[PDB]
Design a protein that fits this description.
1 chains, 115 residues, alpha/beta, five-stranded mixed beta sheet, globular, RNA-binding, Ribosomal_uS11_CS, ribonucleoprotein, Ribosomal_uS11_bac-type, structural constituent of ribosome
Amino acid sequence: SVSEGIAHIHASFNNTIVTITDRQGNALAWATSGGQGFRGSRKSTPFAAQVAAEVAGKAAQEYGVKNIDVLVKGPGPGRESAVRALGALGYKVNSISDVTPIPHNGCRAPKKRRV
RNA sequence: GAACUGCAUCUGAUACUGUUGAGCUAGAGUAUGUGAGAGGAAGGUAGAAUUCCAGGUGUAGCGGUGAAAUGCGUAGAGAUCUG
């Protein structure tokens, strides 16, 4: 159906969500580290992001995407592992971009944790 | 005898303080030219980001923590794109 695609790698400190959409922005497939058997501490590792990206890529590869460009966002650890997973799954990467939301001194952040 | 460190009234001195006359420019101010600055007050505007709302795709999680759970989610969340 679609040959050009975008892989969004939304990676937080707790979880990483790998969605694969077309060039327009309509999601084709997605996977999460918390939806792959890993919970708690294991879920926020690069390996869980690797398996999530593998699952999402293998699910969206039946659609017909071979050309894909990735959009990494967030500071989580799996932001680098997911792209390697996509590259080793046979995806032809178009470009690696880091579009993470950065306010220009906007909304006040939550208070510092006293741990 | 000394002292009573005091007070009062005359006289003298004019270095310093006071009161005065004149002068001076060095302290302090004025006019004129340039300069920097998140100095102040009143309006307008821009770009990111959050939240909310309405939609398209999409499907089973999200979120959170040292772990969790409360919470949010198949009444369709989160993710993604458009207003």
